[PDB]
Amino acid sequence: TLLEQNPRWRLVPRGQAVNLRCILKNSQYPWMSWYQQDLQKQLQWLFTLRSPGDKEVKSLPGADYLATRVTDTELRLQVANMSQGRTLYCTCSAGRGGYAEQFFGPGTRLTVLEDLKNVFPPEVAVFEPSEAEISHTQKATLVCLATGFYPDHVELSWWVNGKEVHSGVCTDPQPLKEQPALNDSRYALSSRLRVSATFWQNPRNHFRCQVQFYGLSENDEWTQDRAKPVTQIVSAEAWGRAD
Amino acid sequence: DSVTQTEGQVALSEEDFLTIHCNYSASGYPALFWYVQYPGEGPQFLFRASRDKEKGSSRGFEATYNKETTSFHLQKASVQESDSAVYYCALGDPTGANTGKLTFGHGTILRVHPNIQNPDPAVYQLRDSKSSDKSVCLFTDFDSQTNVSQSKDSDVYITDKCVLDMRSMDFKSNSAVAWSNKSDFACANAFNNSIIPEDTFFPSPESS
C-alpha cells in the first residue's frame, strides 16, 4: 500500500514487552520513523532511522522503547514496561521531517490491563422496530446493545440477508462505562439500523447485529474456572415481522 | 519549537464555512503541514508549505503560510458530514538537519451535524424476548440543536445522539438510545435530564 505493520492490535498485561514490525515496500521514501498516539490522542515523534543496524532508545510517560532499522525495508520497535495504552505509527518520507512529508501506516493499537480476570466478552441483544415508529414514519429502527465487555476493543457490524450493510447504520463513536469511575469498568455500545417499514415487514428479510470482541490471545495465563474470554464474534438476530 | 491550534472542538452544519487556527513559535524558517485523522484510520497527509504566501490545497481545503502572524490556518468553503475528523497541524525542518521529527499540535475535533429539514421528534419503546431484562427507548428524528444529556439515574444508560444516512432516499436522522436493567423505566421518563422539544411525540405501545 506503501507500509505494512504487524501486529495490528495486541493485549499486553502491565509491565511486559511486545515486539513491533514495519516493512517499507517502496524505496522512493527510504527514511522510516516511529510516532506514538496517546489516549488523549496526542502524536509524538519517537525515532527516525535511515541506515541498517542503527538502534535508538527512548523513555516516555507510559512506555520504554527500543527502535531498530534491521534492513533497507525493515524497522522494529520493542516496547517495554508500558503502563498506558497507545497506538504506534511507522512512517516513511523522501527526507528528514520537513524536506518532503510523512506517510503514516495502519498502526498497532496496544491496550494495557492491570489485571487479566477483568476481561469479559460482550452480551449482544437486538431490539425490533416499534409499531408506533412504523406507522408515524414508515421507517423501522432496529437497535443492537453490546453490554458487559472489558476491555473496550469491539468492532460492531450489521448484516442483512448475509451481506454487510453500511447505509442506514449509526454506531456510537465510543462506548460508555456501566460502572462509571472504576478503573476496570465494563463497557456498553449501541448501534442503529434503519430500513423502510416495507423492508422490515417482509419475512424473507434477515437482520444480524454482530460484535467482534478482541480479548485474550492464542494462549495466556488463564487460572480461572469460567470460560476463556478469547477473541470471538458474538451475534444476535431477528426476522422481518409481517405483523 | 511549538504549534498551537487554539480550539479543541468545532461543531458546524453541513455547508457551513470552516477555519481552524494554526500558530507556530519557531526560530528557523519552518515547514508546516496539515494531517487529517478519520475514525479508525491513522493520520493522512493533506498538504505542505515552507515559504511566506505559498498556498496548499487538497479535497476543498486550503491554507496560506503567513510569516507576519506566524500562521497556516486551515479553511474550507463548504463542510459536509464526511469531513468529521481530527485535523492536526505540524512543523519540522525542510533543511535535512535533522532531528527527523515533526512537531504536532493538540489537534482539533470537527463534528459536522446534518441539516434536518423535516423534524418529527418522537420517543419510542421497542422490545426483545431473546434475553434482556431490559427494554430500550429510542429518541429519534430531532433537530441538531437538541443535546442529549447523560442520565441522573446510575442504573440508566443513555447514548449521545448519532446520525444515520439512508442513501437511496436522501434522508438523515438523529437518534439517541436509553435502556435500564430494571422496572421504574417508562419512555416518558427516559430523557427527563435532556431539554427536548416541547412538541416531542410519545406514542403508546400495543392495542386495547
Author numbering:
A (entry chain B): 1 to 243
B (entry chain A): 1 to 208
Quoted passage from the original study:
To understand the structural features that contribute to CD8 T cell elite control, we focused on a strongly protective CD8 T cell response directed against a parasite-derived peptide (HF10) presented by an atypical MHC-I molecule, H-2Ld. The potent T cell response to the intracellular protozoan parasite, Toxoplasma gondii in resistant (H2d) mouse strains is dominated by CD8 T cells specific for a single peptide, HF10, (derived from the parasite protein GRA6) presented by Ld. Here we show that the Ld-HF10-specific T cell response displays a focused TCR repertoire dominated by Vβ2. Thus, this example of T cell elite control uses a strategy in which both TCR and MHC contribute substantially to peptide specificity and expands the prevailing view of T cell germline recognition.
The majority of T cells used the TRBV1 segment (which encodes Vβ2) together with TRBJ2-1 and displayed a strong selection for a GRG motif in the TCRβ CDR3. Finally, principal component analysis based on TCR distances showed a predominant cluster of similar TCRs which included the previously identified TG6 TCR. Indeed, the TG6 TCRβ coding sequence from the original Ld-HF10 specific T cell hybridoma was found independently in the two additional mice examined, each time paired with a closely related TCRα. Likewise, the TCRα gene of the TG6 TCR was found independently in one additional mouse, paired with a closely related TCRβ gene. Moreover, TG6 is a Vβ2-containing TCR that provides a good representative of this response. We prepared soluble TG6 TCR by expressing and refolding the extracellular domains as described. We noted a clear difference in the conformation of the TCRβ CDR1 and 2 loops, with kinks in the Vβ2 CDR1 and 2 loops due to proline residues at positions 30 and 52. While CDRs are normally flexible to accommodate the antigens, residues 30P and 52P of Vβ2 likely limit the flexibility of CDR loops due to the confined phi angle of proline and contribute to the re-positioning of the loops toward the peptide and MHC α2 helix.
